[PDB]
């Protein structure tokens, strides 16, 4: 097999932990601790090849961590998450992408834009802005919902497919 490093980044209370737990365990957690940062491992078959994925569920940037920095400097794929009903999270995506590019020397870093909480009828951000931003960055954009599990696997599979493209 091959090991693919996937790093989930974004603002707070956007649903990173919910998405990671939904992928790993196929179960939606109503409430999770906002400070726990941990690495999970899964073995999945994409297209016609089996592989192993290790995912770091980032919590924040409050204190320096050696493991988090090592993952940031080594992780290949990045999942930039934001919530549709909050616009500050959407604004922070530029800063997150700039930080990722700066730490990773910004050659061909593969990233995927993710819109979570798409099962709520109230939203301040529309698909037009997110799609335009994703096309400006030249990265795929996927809408996700951790409650209905729509797009949970599609986002990670698109990220690994983009990772394969960078190596190829």
């Amino acid at each position: 097999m091959t090991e693919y490093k996937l790093v989930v980044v974004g603002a707070g209370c956007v649903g990173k932990s919910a998405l990671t737990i939904q992928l790993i365990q196929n179960h939606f957690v109503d409430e999770y601790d906002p400070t726990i940062e941990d690495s999970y491992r899964k073995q999945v078959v994409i297209d016609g090849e089996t592989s192993l994925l290790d995912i770091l569920d980032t919590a924040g940037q409050e204190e320096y961590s050696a493991m988090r920095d090592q993952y940031m400097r080594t992780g290949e794929g990045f999942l930039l998450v934001f919530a549709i009903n909050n616009t500050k999270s959407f604004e922070d995506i530029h800063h997150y992408r700039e930080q990722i590019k700066r730490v990773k020397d910004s050659e061909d870093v593969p990233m995927v834009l993710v819109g979570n909480k798409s099962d709520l009828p109230s939203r301040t951000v529309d698909t037009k802005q997110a799609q335009d931003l994703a096309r400006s960055y030249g990265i795929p954009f996927i809408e996700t919902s951790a409650k209905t599990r729509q797009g949970v696997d599609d986002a990670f599979y698109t990220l690994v497919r983009e990772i394969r493209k960078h190596k190829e």
């Binding site: 365990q25 957690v29 409430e31 400070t35 726990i36 491992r41």
Partner: protein, 152 residues
């Protein structure tokens, strides 16, 4: 519910009042975190002592199979690790991936916690569900001090 928030925040008088009021010491949220879990994770030694003396469970698991010793080792709280060890916590527990607290401590890079866990007695070569040991983690990270401690 009030006990969980009081333990997470770090309130001594509130926790004592809730315990004297009849709040259960083994309450858990959706994932499975107990007041001892949160107190060990956030670093409130006095609350951990009070909960242990009250009759809490020291080998309780969450939905991923992690014990309070796992959280204490992954955060870097030495005193809480020692206190949990002195009351009989399983030093060789395994989560849903079969990760010993030694694995978490070695991956984070907490050399002192590694030394304490080794002194309390724990096998160096334990394989998880993915065929990995602490020495392999040290090789992957490349830390010289961790490899020196493990090989000796």
């Amino acid at each position: 519910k009030k006990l969980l928030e009081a333990a997470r925040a770090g309130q001594d008088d509130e926790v004592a009042a809730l315990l004297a009021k009849g709040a259960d010491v083994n309450a858990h949220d959706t994932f499975g975190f107990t007041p001892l879990h949160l107190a060990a994770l956030y670093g409130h030694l006095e609350i951990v002592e009070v909960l242990l003396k009250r009759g809490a469970d020291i080998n309780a698991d969450d939905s991923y199979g992690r014990t309070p010793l796992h959280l204490a080792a992954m955060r870097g709280h030495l005193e809480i690790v020692e206190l949990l060890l002195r009351w009989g916590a399983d030093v060789n527990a395994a989560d849903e991936e079969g990760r010993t607290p030694l694995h978490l401590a070695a991956k984070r890079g907490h050399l002192e916690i590694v030394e304490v866990l080794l002194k309390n007695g724990a096998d160096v070569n334990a394989q998880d569900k993915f065929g990995k040991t602490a020495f392999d983690i040290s090789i992957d990270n490349g830390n010289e001090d961790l490899a020196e401690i493990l090989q000796k």
